[PDB]
Design a protein around this ligand. Sequence first.
Ligand code: 23E
Length: 551
Amino acid sequence: SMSYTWTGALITPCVYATTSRSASLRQKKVTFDRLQVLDDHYRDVLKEMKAKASTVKAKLLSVEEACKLTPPHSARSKFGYGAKDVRNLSSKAVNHIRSVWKDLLEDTETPIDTTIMAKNEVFCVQPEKGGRKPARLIVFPDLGVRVCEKMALYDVVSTLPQAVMGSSYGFQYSPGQRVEFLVNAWKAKKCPMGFAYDTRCFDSTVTENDIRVEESIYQCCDLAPEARQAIRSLTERLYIGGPLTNSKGQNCGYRRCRASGVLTTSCGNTLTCYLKAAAACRAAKLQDCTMLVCGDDLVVICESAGTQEDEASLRAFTEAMTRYSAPPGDPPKPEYDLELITSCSSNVSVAHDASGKRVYYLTRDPTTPLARAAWETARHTPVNSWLGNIIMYAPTLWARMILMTHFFSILLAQEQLEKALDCQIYGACYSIEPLDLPQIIQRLHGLSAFSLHSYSPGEINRVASCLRKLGVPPLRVWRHRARSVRARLLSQGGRAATCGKYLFNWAVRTKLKLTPIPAASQLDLSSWFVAGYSGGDIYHSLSRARPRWFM
Ligand SMILES: O=C(O)/C=C/c1ccc(NC(=O)C2(NC(=O)c3ccc4c(C5CCCCC5)c5n(c4c3)CC(=O)Nc3ccccc3-5)CCCC2)cc1
């Protein structure tokens, strides 16, 4: 069947930002018929995944618990209420949610309406390698349906992927644990070979059978009878496909592939990618495979069989993936150094702690984080990618010297250090106070993230070249600015002094002895590196359990 069918109505609007103007180019790439042939390898992996899913017990969320997961600026319902009414448990919001739920239990077939929209994402215009990227498309149901998805499936999508995939499930790891996983897998092989597999338009490669196969896995959970019916009805009415409506309310067409804006997008994509990849590893006869899967993002670390044999087995792996309806964008390339593998737009790098001990860390090319931070500094944005980048890439030279220096001086100037901001962590929205950054970093990356030095020449040159390309002042200017930022933060005491002393310890001539922050343990990070929720409309406010008077 065709992934999409179009009426002809436009996808109307809601260095550079992507807009609805380029929607046509995206629509052309994502529209095609899918050819899928399954085999014994696929059926075997599937049964093994289901045997693991069978250990899961999922809870039905209450209306109140589902409403509390809703982002404050989540798109309003077409039924006379918004995200604020949902979060406040307004009678009108709650009544409509209960009627949407009742309708899921009673109606098993009528397709549910969705809105199709162009995503506005910032990228860096580089005329050296082609041109501009067309806008990505987002497909999502009404607010009432999104609350019902949480009730039926939040606990499933949060618990099931790790139980099924175990250590292969990428979203259970903090950046440091991901690095630890990849390094341990690499060191465990006699002669290691790794590769990243890039599926061309993954969401569009997802068939209605893949969506039913994914439901067959959810159905292995112990579920409340209403959760079991809601999952069944949501599968047939929403997940498998349905009609598309543009921002103007016009019939835009029809979808028979993965919706990017449903609660199950990340879980379904991870399970599907893993299933197809694990089966393709058997068909390719790859030896001692270790996989790391994050939605459509796949990395495979295996045992090398020789240079020519590795190239041959990768072409065979690709053939199997293609039969399973997952053909590649860029064909996969065998790598023999762990640092050369780009996965989830990131790579492993190593540095030293204050004692000369080696520390592995996750980094990436800083162009897109710097261009997005420049955009966010220029105009008010709903999400602060700069904050999420500081959190995820805290050990990096670029996040420490540039992002921390720039943003802490702006916050000092605006007197907004305590003002909570929204950022995305594995697709989920977190409301975080910049004053909590030292404690967050210590908890995720360890105390060493504040003492890292001996960065690699390759990483230093990538950062320096990027600063030059973007007209950003060089590293020595940042060191000078961080000294003043640090002195002003130290002068304020409390959490602000801790920001100065810990985040900017790299900036001083004579480096301080840093002891662990006592209040860091109080932070409730329980929901942090559990699962992926990209397009899942998930929100959390950072909380502190058991506060001591003196902190
Ligand atoms: O000794 C030497 O050899 C060099 C000395 C030297 C060179 C340039 C400066 N620049 C500045 O002072 C100013 N800009 C900056 O001090 C500046 C700060 C952050 C900047 C950023 C990002 C970096 C990440 C956080 C968000 C801001 C960008 N650009 C920045 C410029 C350059 C810019 O204007 N825009 C972009 C566009 C895309 C990406 C980055 C940038 C402020 C007043 C005058 C212009 C200062 C000193």
